[PDB]
Every structure is written in C-alpha cells, then in structure tokens.
Structure 1
Amino acid sequence: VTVKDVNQQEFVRALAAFLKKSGKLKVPEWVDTVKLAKHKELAPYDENWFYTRAASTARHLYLRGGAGVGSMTKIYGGRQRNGVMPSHFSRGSKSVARRVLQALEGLKMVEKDQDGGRKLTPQGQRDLDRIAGQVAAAKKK
C-alpha cells in the first residue's frame, strides 16, 4: 500500500506528528514572528506549523520530483486581497520553503538532484510510504 492509496489530508496529519516525535528537524528561530507569505493577514493558528508544511512539502516531493524552492512558492500560492483593488496571485514565502527543504536535507528525507532542485531519498520514501501503511490500517472508514 502506497501514499496515493490514502486520503492525503489525514496523511499529513500523521506525517507532521511523525516529524514531531522524531525530534530532529531544525525549526528555525522565527516561527512565532514570521508571516508565511505576503498574502496573509495573520500568522498560522497552529503554532506547530513548520512540522505540518515540512510534511506537506515532502509529500509533494514524493508525487512531483525535482521541485526547487521556486516550485515550492508556486505550490503554496493563493489570492492576495489588495483590499479595495482586485485580487491577484502571490507566490508563497521563499525563506520558509527554503528552511523546510534544508530541514529535510538534514533529516535525509531528501537529496538535491542532478539538473537542479530537490527530490526525496529512499530513507525518506521509507517514512512517507510507511506512514501511509499506518494510516491505511487505522480502520475501515
């Protein structure tokens, strides 16, 4: 049983918790202070969000390979209220996407590929596909 075989919402719930339990990520200094992208009004309501988006970034890297940080800002883009002017697409925060991919670099979930950009590593494919197998065997629901 692979990750595609699982409901992706509840997968990253577990992956983030897997990333907490391990306790060797490197969440940086900012976390509290930082915004997350120029989109935003507010800071994330989950105060342990770096674990969640590191999880969401990895699971993306499993599906689509060779993804740079510029690729990562595009995936976490969205609407931007100019407020009184019409909305437009803003790309996600660079540094926090970079700080994530460096964190998975140190974890050895990933490896920076030939022809540029990150791609995930077997020892990472372990964790991702293992936790899918855990989710699949949660219950018949």
Structure 2
Amino acid sequence: GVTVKDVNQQEFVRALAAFLKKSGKLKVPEWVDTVKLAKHKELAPYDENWFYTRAASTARHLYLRGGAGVGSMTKIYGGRQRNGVMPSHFSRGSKSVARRVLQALEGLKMVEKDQDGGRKLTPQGQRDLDRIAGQVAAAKK
C-alpha cells in the first residue's frame, strides 16, 4: 500500500531516529557528545541524539540512490562555510561522522557495501523503512 516516497520527510526524519533509539544497538562512537560535525560550521548540535538522527537520515538516501560512499555522504552534508571577513564558500562534512554511520548501518543489517562502490540498502532495512513510513502515514490519518 504505502511506501517511503509518499510521506512528508520533515516528519519522517524524526520517526526514523526514534525507531533506532528504541533499538539501541548502533555502535555509538565515544566522541559523539564533543565533536564538531563538519568544517563549515562551529557550534555543536542542540539536541543530544544527533547521531541517532543522522544515521537513519543518511540511510534514507541509500534507498533513493545506492552505490554512494563516504564521498557522496560528505557531499550531501555539506554547507556554507562562512569564512568571516572573506566571501563564504561551500565545504564538505566530516568524513568520520558519515563513516561511523555507514559502519553502524552495515553492522546492524540495514545497508551493506556493494559493487560500483558505496553502499546499497538491504531488503531488511528496505522493509524497515516503509514499515516506519506506514506508521507515519497512520499518524497522518
């Protein structure tokens, strides 16, 4: 019936984090509460579950387009580095804050590494994502 693409993503990005928080087997790095997430900004996140957000918020892109590795993920989490007195420029994300996500989601079987580089997403996580999205659509109903 329902799928992943038929639902508002702005509310879906909370439920994908909540489902990973209820599981709690994500191999969290020790440095998640102290690290800056990229080069383009300076301040830490306000919430305390940013890794729990960013893990399945990275995984939802791995259903849209697979074969995408840590370079594609440091690209899609890039932003406007304000260089202060000079004009601003686009810059990447941190490599490790996506690499720990990918190492987590190949550990717990939601994605796996695939030919033509990158990660593709397993049928188990493909079941899991629209299993969440059906609940989100039921919350809409």
Shift in Å, 1:78: 0.8
The SS at the match of 1:114 is coil
Partner of 1:112: 113
The SS at the match of 1:137 is helix
Which portions of structure 1, spanning 4 or more consecutive aligned residues, are displaced by more than 6 angstroms?
A: none
Shift in Å, 1:100: 0.3
Whole-Å separation in 2 of the counterparts to 1:73 and 1:49: 16
TM-score, L = length of structure 2: 0.96
Residues 5-32 of structure 1: per-residue CA shift (max 9 Å, x gap): 0001111100100000011111111011
The SS at the match of 2:60 is helix
Residues 93-137 of structure 1: per-residue CA shift (max 9 Å, x gap): 100100000000011101100121111101110111100101001
Q: Percent of aligned positions with the same letter in both sequences?
A: 100
Whole-Å separation in 2 of the counterparts to 1:40 and 1:89: 11
Residues 44-98 of structure 1: per-residue CA shift (max 9 Å, x gap): 1111100100011001111111110000000000100110100001111100100
Whole-Å separation in 2 of the counterparts to 1:78 and 1:119: 25
Q: How many residues align?
A: 140
Whole-Å separation in 2 of the counterparts to 1:120 and 1:20: 20
Shift in Å, 1:41: 1.7
For the aligned residue pairs, the C-alpha RMSD in angstroms reads: 0.9
Whole-Å separation in 2 of the counterparts to 1:112 and 1:126: 18
Q: Is 1:96 paired with 2:125?
A: no
